[PDB]
Symmetry: C2
Subunit: 201 residues, 2 copies
């Protein structure tokens, strides 16, 4: 495990243009060397939900014209820098707008982290929904196609969720959604099911 | 237009059994005569979302074994009583559980009439969504298959809606969701579009 890592965030709005236009192998390598960096986690998929590579299971950032993920792995590997790859799991904001039925709900029907679409911020998906199948596909694509040094999966953990899918499933399994213990235990199974499916894929 | 009408409600939970088991042509006719009733609006589709006939575009109440709508029209028509037919539009609670993405939202993401699924009551659909296409199909089926004397369409009117579909559509049409006037005017178009499609179908 390398001692000198950078976690390179790239949560980038669809409403910003010319993504990566000022990227260069030379600039990326010079700054890693200036920083004495020997590992840099770079983005395949951000909170806004875009891919930074020409993806078949997800949509590339609509203002990105080239394989930024590919260019970063190559530039770093050519100077002996490892490159783990980041995938946002809990957040996919451009999918949130198409599939709000897959978002987490509390007892009072509230989304997190932000409780409406009329305010800025991100809306967390429930991994007890078919969103899990889309995550596995997208993780599989990145692991097949890119020579990364690992996967960092973000916005995950044991939750308590009262979404339509969870409430139906709890009732069918004889659990009581009004019993907090039952919902906490459901969420322990939901999270373990997600990490088991990731390790097997 | 007949002077002596009854509006016969039939909002019936999936969790009640033996629907219609004590129905009879004789009982239905005796009570219409006791009441001096010359028209009775009967249900094709209730707030809970079930059909009271063996429907191909909607699901029959899961505890109903026979064509209750058909039996009521026949029993009434055979004693000269007209039978308009009721269809819940705004409410379809069993669909609400499958398609929460089609439900109305206020500025703060709240459903109406009831602001969560963890409380009893009904959740109103937005007619700016593909739910409108399902309503037209279901209205078409009832009008084709049954010799009714009219259609009563319930839980409809001009709304203000901030659901994901409405917010995207308003932004694409250059309307401002933060401008109340813009959202009111959008809802006037949404409602007129619904009543125009019903009259044409
Ligand atoms: Zn859930
Ligand atoms: Zn709407």
């Amino acid at each position: 495990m390398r001692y000198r890592q950078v976690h390179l965030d790239f949560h980038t709005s669809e409403h910003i243009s010319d993504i990566g236009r000022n990227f260069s192998k030379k600039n990326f390598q010079e700054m890693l060397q200036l920083g004495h960096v020997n590992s840099i986690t770079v983005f395949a998929k951000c909170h806004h939900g875009w891919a930074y590579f020409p993806s078949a299971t997800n949509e590339i950032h609509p203002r990105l014209d080239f394989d930024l993920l590919g260019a970063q792995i190559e530039a770093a590997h050519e100077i002996g820098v490892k490159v783990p790859i980041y995938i946002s799991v809990g957040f996919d904001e451009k999918l949130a707008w198409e599939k709000p039925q897959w978002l987490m709900r509390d007892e009072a029907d509230r989304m997190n982290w932000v409780d409406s679409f009329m305010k800025p911020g991100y809306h967390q998906f429930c991994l007890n929904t078919p969103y899990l199948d889309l995550v596995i596909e997208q993780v599989q694509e990145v692991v097949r196609k890119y020579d990364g040094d690992g996967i960092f999966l973000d916005i995950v953990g044991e939750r308590t969720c009262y979404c339509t899918t969870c409430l139906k499933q709890m009732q069918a399994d004889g659990l009581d959604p009004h019993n907090k213990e039952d919902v906490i235990a459901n969420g322990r199974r939901i999270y373990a099911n997600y990490t088991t499916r990731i390790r097997e894929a």
